[PDB]
Symmetry: C3
Subunit: 205 residues, 3 copies
């Protein structure tokens, strides 16, 4: 039947007995259970967010949402001072940009404030869909995480007086974000007009 | 002749017939068009920017430009108010840091301004090489995207008066960036000296 | 002995002699030194920081420290002006967030200052463990890299006068960071109370 044999196939006549064998690369293959098997089958790694595998085009990429994720918080902005405290209905815009959380305040009119004080935002409830309270937790306990200025107008018996307020992100406790108002320029007033302002802090959730 | 046969190769006599055959692992291989073929050939993924494959060292990395990309815009800064509007020749420095665009203003001397108003930057033309107009488009329509303060000196005509201006990134339309000046401290003046200032906004291009 | 063969094996006959041969997918395999060898052995890429391979779960991810790395600098904050200069003992908090370096100043009381001037931070020494001087080098030479406002109180014979100071990150030279105080509101004073403030600049180290 079989006259000759071509590689990988070879016939070795050792001890007057002709034996047929299959030749293979030792580092590539191995015989297990009397079959040709691959030595070291390479398993492809998985990817943790913000890295993702686009299975449709077999491409690894940074998730789009990582650069920008929007949301809103609806609740009551709490002003706190031992001698004066109030609640104002606000809706603030939120945006996750990389490892930062940005809060955007639109203009607002509030009751009067003391020379210094605290603003508290309770994220326990009020977040738009897709957002969890934990998503607003800062990635550091350093105080302050960031400071910004808010431009205001103090209303005092008809006259509008331009001033500023310095605001610092200082604490986060069980979903309550605390923004300290260290001070700034001040005058006796009845009401405050706040121009829009943004504040951001590190957040890796 | 052929006396013996070593694995993967095996001989089986069944139904008075002796048939030789090649022994293979069924999860590693198969037979396609009567030849040994690999089952499940693993294809290596490609990478979308800012991820890149350094082919020279077979290493996946984040592109260097992602952390920092510089540029300049040369044009006319437009101040807009219904009762007053002007154009000033400026060159502002630009830097792309991750998913942020930073605009850096050098000191400047401009005509007088109203208590509030708009600054417009037309990116349709004026960008340095490598930059396209689309590269300045914000990644969100939230208003404001960011706010900052600019320190100014109002020339009363006899005296130089220190004040501030609050600036907010508010809109981008077909290459025109709009920076609103909500207000701040103010006095009657002939001209404005602006100290340097920076403003940044989210941008994922 | 051997009655017949089966695929991959074939016994083809030509030119008067019958020969046994092994069949293979020519794209998948080849013969090298008369042995079955695979073509195109896939080599897995390595990863450059902030990308890393979690070997335990065979997963590629962004390093945790990339989003947040804390530290402290302890030294003397140097104020510089041709007609006045001093040194104050400070400890400032530092945080690396992505490609940004954030400096956090706690409240401080310093000696009096001129209408404008420079603040210098010498990172050559004073950094907490894990931090090198090179880690504070900006990723661009643009001036200013960033500006912020500091809220101050000018102390002049017991009276406290609220004002602001504009601060810009302007230069880094051999470990010395320079923060220019372009100006802001001012009055004659003997000492300055500074509210807390943060400033950040691009840094890809
Ligand atoms: C940060 C923020 O949420 N800013 C709002 C603020 C604050 O909610 C508020 O001033 C804090 O004290 O209010 C602004 O005006 C809105 C406010 O007056 C509410 C009160 O009901 O009405 C909104 O519009 C109403 C309108 O009053 C109705 O007559 C109408 O039928 O429906 C509208 C629904 O929107 C005001 O826009 C403010 O500028 O003071 C808007 C800020 O965005
Ligand atoms: C943001 C920005 O671009 N700031 C510039 C500003 C503004 O261009 C300007 O003040 C807006 O009104 O100008 C600063 O000064 C430059 C300005 O006066 C221009 C006017 O020609 O000249 C520049 O230097 C010239 C110099 O005037 C010529 O005599 C000389 O032959 O060439 C020089 C270089 O072209 C001024 O630097 C300003 O300080 O207000 C500089 C800002 O960076
Ligand atoms: C940024 C910083 O390090 N801030 C410190 C600050 C400065 O060290 C200092 O005021 C610069 O002049 O000091 C603070 O605390 C002070 C002590 O450092 C000082 O030894 O004693 C002071 C009272 O006698 C004061 O308590 C401050 O000014 O509050 C603390 C701050 O974090």
């Amino acid at each position: 039947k079989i006259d000759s044999v071509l590689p990988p196939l070879t016939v070795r006549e050792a001890s007057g007995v002709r034996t047929l064998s299959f030749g293979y690369d030792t580092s590539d293959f191995t015989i297990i259970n009397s079959v040709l098997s691959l030595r070291s089958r390479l398993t492809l790694p998985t990817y943790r967010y913000p890295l993702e595998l686009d299975t449709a085009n077999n491409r690894v990429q940074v998730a789009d949402r990582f650069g920008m994720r929007t949301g809103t918080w609806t609740g009551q902005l709490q002003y706190q001072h031992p001698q004066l405290s109030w609640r104002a209905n606000v809706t603030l815009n939120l945006m996750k940009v990389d490892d930062w959380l940005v809060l955007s305040f639109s203009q607002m009119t509030t009751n009067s404030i003391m020379a210094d004080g605290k603003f508290v935002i309770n994220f326990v409830s009020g977040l738009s869909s897709g957002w969890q309270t934990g998503d607003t937790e800062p990635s550091s306990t350093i105080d302050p995480l960031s400071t910004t200025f808010a431009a205001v107008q103090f209303l005092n018996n008809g006259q509008r007086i331009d001033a500023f307020r310095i605001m610092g992100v200082s604490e986060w406790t069980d979903g309550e974000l605390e923004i300290k108002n260290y001070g700034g320029t001040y005058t006796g007033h009845t009401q405050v007009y706040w121009a829009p302002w943004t504040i951001m802090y590190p957040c890796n959730v």
